[PDB]
């Protein structure tokens, strides 16, 4: 387990990526695996069985949970890392692919199918972050939240669990995904100025 | 234990009840004695352990009935009796007292007295009947009450117990007060008439 290698591997072996996606993107990616790692069980873990409402209603509880939470923050950004990943996976298959026919018996079309990656790369981060807005406007969590949805009678008081903790890695999650817009950014224009 | 005797005892014996005051007032004060002794205990009895909210909060429960139960029908009642039986007893004591000091050795201030007792007996029915009414509007009670109120967080449901029995006595005894209301006019009426 060398450098070279876990340097080839995080690389894909495109020959057309420069240094700011080549040596700081691959860096991002693994802060942020190690990141999601580190919190995505310690931090989430009980972020259902802690939370807790002050009525005495069955069923209350589950229901201001899915209200106020429609998707973790973990798994919002798993899932963002997974589709951000995607284009990367596509485009290192798809050297592959080319080293393997053309072993079996060209740089254009792998120039365009890497812009088109990284550009599919900045379009998903950009979603997932307006997304991230739309369901959690601001970058603060709470202690108090009032909920008012069937069955729980009237407005109910639910205490999140975590808030500070789960806010600071909200906010390192966040830096991160902002340094990837900016470095996919960066990169996209550098190769358009570089072709012409 | 004659009716004669029983009958003295509820007229007063001051010469100078008619008969809607000696054998009508007197029938309907044994009527509210004897409702108010067969649903003081039975159905007032667990007012207060048998009213739940739907909070988890403690002492919730505690405020809420002292918020809509200022004082109980039952307590209001009693203490309307007591008052309004009052200046009977007031006119007796004196009636009595009066032949005590003639046996040891006044028509016209017996009368007063009386016309007096009768006027401050309809007073003090009126008096019970409006503050009956302040504090709670309405013949009838409701199963829900949603309160708001220290400590009880934003507005929590309650459940009164036996609401329907409790309406069923509140008319019973509202309208005998009634009654009793227009038996005292219809006497001061009748005694200020042959007066003139
Ligand atoms: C995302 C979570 C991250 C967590 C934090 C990680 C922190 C860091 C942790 C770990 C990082 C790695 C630590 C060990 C590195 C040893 C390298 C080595 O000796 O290489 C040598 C041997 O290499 C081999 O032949 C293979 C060695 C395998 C290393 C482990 C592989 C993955 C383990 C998965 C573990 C799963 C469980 C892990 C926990 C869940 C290189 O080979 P060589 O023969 O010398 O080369 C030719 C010789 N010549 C050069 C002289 C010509
Ligand atoms: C608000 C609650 C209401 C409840 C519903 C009540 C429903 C009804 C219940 C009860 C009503 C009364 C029932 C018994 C009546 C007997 C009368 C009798 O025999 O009289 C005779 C005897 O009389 C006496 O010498 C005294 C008799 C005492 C009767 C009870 C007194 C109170 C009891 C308190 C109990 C406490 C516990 C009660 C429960 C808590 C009359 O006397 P005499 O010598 O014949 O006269 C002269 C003779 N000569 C005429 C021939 C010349
Ligand atoms: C420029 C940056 C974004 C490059 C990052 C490279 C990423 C997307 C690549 C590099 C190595 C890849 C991994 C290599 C091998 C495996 C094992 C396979 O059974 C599941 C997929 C998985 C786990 C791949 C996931 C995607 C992966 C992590
Ligand atoms: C015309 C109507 C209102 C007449 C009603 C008469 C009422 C006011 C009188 C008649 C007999 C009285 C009772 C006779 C004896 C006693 C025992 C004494 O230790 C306490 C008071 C008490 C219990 C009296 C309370 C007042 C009383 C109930």
């Not at 990616?29 to 995505?40: E, G, H, K």
């Not at 406007?137 to 789960?166: H, I, Q, W």
Request: aromatic share 14%; charged share 10%.
């Amino acid at each position: 387990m060398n450098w070279t290698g876990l340097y080839t591997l995080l690389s894909g072996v495109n020959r057309h990526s420069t240094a700011i996606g080549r040596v700081w993107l691959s860096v991002i990616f693994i802060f942020r695996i190690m990141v999601l790692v580190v919190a995505a069980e310690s931090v989430w873990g009980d972020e259902k069985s802690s939370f807790i409402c002050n009525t005495l209603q069955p069923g209350c509880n589950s229901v201001c949970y899915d209200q106020f939470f429609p998707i973790s923050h973990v798994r919002l950004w798993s899932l963002q890392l997974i589709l951000v990943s995607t284009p990367a996976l596509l485009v290192a298959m798809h050297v592959a692919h080319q080293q393997h026919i053309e072993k079996k018996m060209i740089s254009g079309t792998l120039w365009w199918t890497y812009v088109i990656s990284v550009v599919f790369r900045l379009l998903f981060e950009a979603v997932f972050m307006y997304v991230f807005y739309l369901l959690y406007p601001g970058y603060a969590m709470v202690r108090l939240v009032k909920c008012d949805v069937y069955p729980c009678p009237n407005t109910v008081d639910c205490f999140v669990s975590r808030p500070t903790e789960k806010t600071v890695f909200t906010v390192f999650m966040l830096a991160a995904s902002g340094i990837c817009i900016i470095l996919n950014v960066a990169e996209v224009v550098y190769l358009i100025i570089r072709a012409c």
